[PDB]
Design an enzyme around this catalytic site. Structure first.
Site, PDB file in Angstrom:
ATOM      1  N   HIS A 102      -2.527   7.038  -1.076  1.00  0.00           N
ATOM      2  CA  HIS A 102      -3.573   7.669  -0.255  1.00  0.00           C
ATOM      3  C   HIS A 102      -3.022   8.393   0.973  1.00  0.00           C
ATOM      4  O   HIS A 102      -3.706   8.503   1.991  1.00  0.00           O
ATOM      5  CB  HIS A 102      -4.643   6.655   0.170  1.00  0.00           C
ATOM      6  CG  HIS A 102      -5.269   5.918  -0.973  1.00  0.00           C
ATOM      7  ND1 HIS A 102      -5.797   4.655  -0.840  1.00  0.00           N
ATOM      8  CD2 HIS A 102      -5.428   6.257  -2.274  1.00  0.00           C
ATOM      9  CE1 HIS A 102      -6.274   4.253  -2.005  1.00  0.00           C
ATOM     10  NE2 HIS A 102      -6.064   5.209  -2.891  1.00  0.00           N
TER      11      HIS A 102
ATOM     12  N   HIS B 119       0.873  -1.181   0.000  1.00  0.00           N
ATOM     13  CA  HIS B 119       0.000   0.000   0.000  1.00  0.00           C
ATOM     14  C   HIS B 119       0.905   1.224   0.000  1.00  0.00           C
ATOM     15  O   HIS B 119       1.416   1.639   1.046  1.00  0.00           O
ATOM     16  CB  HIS B 119      -0.945  -0.016   1.200  1.00  0.00           C
ATOM     17  CG  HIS B 119      -2.014   1.039   1.167  1.00  0.00           C
ATOM     18  ND1 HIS B 119      -1.938   2.165   0.374  1.00  0.00           N
ATOM     19  CD2 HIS B 119      -3.193   1.129   1.836  1.00  0.00           C
ATOM     20  CE1 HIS B 119      -3.020   2.906   0.559  1.00  0.00           C
ATOM     21  NE2 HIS B 119      -3.798   2.301   1.442  1.00  0.00           N
TER      22      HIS B 119
ATOM     23  N   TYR C 134      -0.665   7.671   3.111  1.00  0.00           N
ATOM     24  CA  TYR C 134      -0.179   6.871   4.231  1.00  0.00           C
ATOM     25  C   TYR C 134       1.358   6.875   4.201  1.00  0.00           C
ATOM     26  O   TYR C 134       1.953   7.728   3.543  1.00  0.00           O
ATOM     27  CB  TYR C 134      -0.856   5.495   4.186  1.00  0.00           C
ATOM     28  CG  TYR C 134      -2.344   5.624   4.445  1.00  0.00           C
ATOM     29  CD1 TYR C 134      -2.820   6.137   5.656  1.00  0.00           C
ATOM     30  CD2 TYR C 134      -3.264   5.285   3.473  1.00  0.00           C
ATOM     31  CE1 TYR C 134      -4.182   6.274   5.895  1.00  0.00           C
ATOM     32  CE2 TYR C 134      -4.622   5.415   3.701  1.00  0.00           C
ATOM     33  CZ  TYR C 134      -5.075   5.901   4.904  1.00  0.00           C
ATOM     34  OH  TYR C 134      -6.438   6.014   5.094  1.00  0.00           O
TER      35      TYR C 134
HETATM   36  C1  LIG Z   1     -14.691   1.615   3.022  1.00  0.00           C
HETATM   37  C2  LIG Z   1     -13.439   1.642   2.191  1.00  0.00           C
HETATM   38  C3  LIG Z   1     -12.248   1.144   2.687  1.00  0.00           C
HETATM   39  C4  LIG Z   1     -11.106   1.185   1.890  1.00  0.00           C
HETATM   40  N1  LIG Z   1      -9.918   0.682   2.389  1.00  0.00           N
HETATM   41  C5  LIG Z   1      -8.780   0.671   1.616  1.00  0.00           C
HETATM   42  C6  LIG Z   1      -7.607   0.108   2.090  1.00  0.00           C
HETATM   43  O1  LIG Z   1      -7.552  -0.424   3.203  1.00  0.00           O
HETATM   44  N2  LIG Z   1      -6.501   0.146   1.275  1.00  0.00           N
HETATM   45  C7  LIG Z   1      -6.537   0.724   0.020  1.00  0.00           C
HETATM   46  O2  LIG Z   1      -5.543   0.732  -0.707  1.00  0.00           O
HETATM   47  N3  LIG Z   1      -7.698   1.270  -0.450  1.00  0.00           N
HETATM   48  C8  LIG Z   1      -8.814   1.231   0.339  1.00  0.00           C
HETATM   49  N4  LIG Z   1      -9.978   1.776  -0.151  1.00  0.00           N
HETATM   50  C9  LIG Z   1      -9.979   2.336  -1.543  1.00  0.00           C
HETATM   51  C10 LIG Z   1     -10.453   1.197  -2.449  1.00  0.00           C
HETATM   52  O3  LIG Z   1      -9.446   0.206  -2.535  1.00  0.00           O
HETATM   53  C11 LIG Z   1     -10.701   1.627  -3.882  1.00  0.00           C
HETATM   54  O4  LIG Z   1      -9.572   2.279  -4.414  1.00  0.00           O
HETATM   55  C12 LIG Z   1     -11.888   2.534  -4.082  1.00  0.00           C
HETATM   56  O5  LIG Z   1     -12.958   2.193  -3.227  1.00  0.00           O
HETATM   57  C13 LIG Z   1     -12.248   2.208  -5.522  1.00  0.00           C
HETATM   58  O6  LIG Z   1     -13.259   3.051  -5.915  1.00  0.00           O
HETATM   59  P1  LIG Z   1     -14.734   2.452  -6.003  1.00  0.00           P
HETATM   60  O7  LIG Z   1     -15.205   2.316  -4.567  1.00  0.00           O
HETATM   61  O8  LIG Z   1     -15.571   3.494  -6.703  1.00  0.00           O
HETATM   62  O9  LIG Z   1     -14.715   1.127  -6.766  1.00  0.00           O
HETATM   63  C14 LIG Z   1     -11.132   1.726   0.616  1.00  0.00           C
HETATM   64  C15 LIG Z   1     -12.325   2.235   0.132  1.00  0.00           C
HETATM   65  C16 LIG Z   1     -13.467   2.206   0.922  1.00  0.00           C
HETATM   66  C17 LIG Z   1     -14.752   2.780   0.387  1.00  0.00           C
END
Ligand SMILES: Cc1cc2nc3c(=O)[nH]c(=O)nc-3n(C[C@H](O)[C@H](O)[C@H](O)COP(=O)(O)O)c2cc1C
Ligand SMILES: NC(=O)c1ccc[n+]([C@@H]2O[C@H](COP(=O)([O-])OP(=O)(O)OC[C@H]3O[C@@H](n4cnc5c(N)ncnc54)[C@H](OP(=O)(O)O)[C@@H]3O)[C@@H](O)[C@H]2O)c1
Length: 363
Positions: A179, A176, A181
């Site tokens: 975002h 990861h 982090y």
């Molecule tokens: C509730 C939630 C938790 C997420 N947790 C992570 C995460 O732990 N790691 C990460 O790389 N992206 C995380 N994401 C981003 C998602 O991996 C993804 O990039 C994003 O939701 C994709 O867009 P979409 O929801 O429109 O398909 C999270 C997104 C949501 C909504």
């Protein structure tokens, strides 16, 4: 439908291109994977489908959300093995996402209430608030900027967690690096204000992610390593003055790691913000620059996913929120069946069923 043409992800033979995006859900009580996670991932697993887990801690200091799983203890490995087993019983491939939040944490998430670690001593601004264990939102604190010895020990935590993931049976891991982090706090020149060898130049800012990827590649092999970045996403004050150049600098280093190690990474995974033509052009520019498999993510739908694969913009498409509320998202996309809405109020709650495993399948 191009989403259902098979794809060879290096060692892995995928039967379709619909990927479960990594999603923090906060059901892993006390950082231990629970039976509920097994039900959740099994519901979404398909034969020849690729799944990426929620972000998983690599060390006691790496969390900034409540009840996220770790993979740094033997207990966590044993519990993860039960989840991987039910996913493999469905014929799916599954990677564990290794996640360190850096400064995006709080004393309540840190051992002994210590300050979170970062590239920098600057806090995330109060434009952003952190989800607390009681469901309120708190203030991000001032982090502690780590030296190069400590950086090398965080790299070792990624290395050990990657080995633990393999011991639990995962097919691979995802770094990861997105975002805002920890890794992105080194990458982004809007955060990284260091004046040592990890700061300043673009090369210096890419050193941390390069060393993390090199360490996990050396431990478990490049074909079991995916890398996720987001150069154009400004989450948690993570802006860069030249996002495209930053992304191309990361891509060049990934290409060089592959050439030096003699093996390709599993993939590069990029999330985009949702200007629409400019954002698409930047994603395609990164894809064209990278020697390997490209996973695109962020706001995708059935129609946008079909177009991405059909136009050559990506090899695989990951879906987040639509996979929360459609356990059988792959089948729904195959049949062009209507999709069910998701409820953001239960994205991060602790209930093992409500808003987690009780979204229905197609009738
Ligand atoms: C509730 C939630 C938790 C997420 N947790 C992570 C995460 O732990 N790691 C990460 O790389 N992206 C995380 N994401 C981003 C998602 O991996 C993804 O990039 C994003 O939701 C994709 O867009 P979409 O929801 O429109 O398909 C999270 C997104 C949501 C909504
Ligand atoms: O000096 P130093 O900083 O190179 O110390 P070093 O510890 O010899 O190398 C630093 C890192 O860069 C790798 N590396 C060495 N040469 C490379 C090349 N030409 N292209 C891509 N990666 C390379 C090394 O992998 P290896 O140690 O596996 O060669 C190591 O992971």
């Amino acid at each position: 439908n191009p989403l259902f043409s098979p794809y060879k992800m290096g060692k892995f033979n995928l039967s379709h291109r619909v990927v479960l995006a990594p999603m923090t859900r906060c059901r892993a009580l006390n950082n231990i994977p629970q039976a509920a996670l097994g039900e959740y991932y099994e519901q979404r697993a398909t034969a020849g489908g690729f799944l990426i887990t929620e972000g998983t801690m690599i060390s006691p200091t790496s969390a900034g959300f409540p009840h996220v799983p770790g993979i740094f203890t033997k207990e966590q490995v044993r519990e993860w093995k039960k989840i991987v087993d039910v996913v493999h019983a469905k014929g799916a491939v599954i990677f564990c996402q290794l996640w360190h939040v850096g400064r995006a944490s709080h004393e309540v998430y840190q051992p002994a209430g210590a300050a979170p670690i970062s590239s920098t001593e600057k806090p995330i601004s109060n434009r952003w608030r952190i989800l607390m264990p009681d469901g309120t939102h708190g203030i991000y604190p001032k982090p502690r900027a780590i030296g190069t010895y400590e950086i090398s020990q965080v790299v070792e935590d990624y290395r050990r967690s990657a080995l633990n993931a393999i011991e639990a049976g995962f097919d691979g891991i995802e770094i990861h690096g997105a975002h805002g982090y920890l890794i992105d706090q080194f990458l982004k020149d809007g955060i990284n204000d260091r004046t040592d060898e990890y700061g300043g130049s673009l090369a210096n800012r890419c050193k941390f992610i390069t060393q993390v990827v090199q360490a996990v590649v050396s431990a478990i092999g490049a074909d079991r390593v995916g890398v996720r970045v987001s150069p154009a996403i400004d989450h948690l004050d993570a802006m860069d003055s030249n996002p495209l150049s930053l992304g191309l600098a990361v891509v060049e280093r990934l290409n060089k790691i592959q050439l030096h190690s003699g093996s390709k990474l599993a993939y590069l995974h990029v999330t985009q913000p949702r200007s629409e033509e400019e954002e698409a052009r930047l994603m395609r520019t990164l894809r064209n620059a990278y020697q390997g498999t490209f996973i695109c993510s962020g706001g995708y739908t059935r129609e946008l996913g079909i177009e991405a694969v059909a136009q050559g913009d990506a090899d695989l498409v990951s879906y987040g929120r639509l996979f929360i509320s459609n356990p059988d998202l792959v089948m729904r996309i195959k049949l062009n069946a209507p999709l069910n809405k998701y409820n953001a109020k239960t994205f991060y709650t602790q209930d093992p069923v409500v808003g987690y495993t009780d979204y229905p399948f197609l009738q």
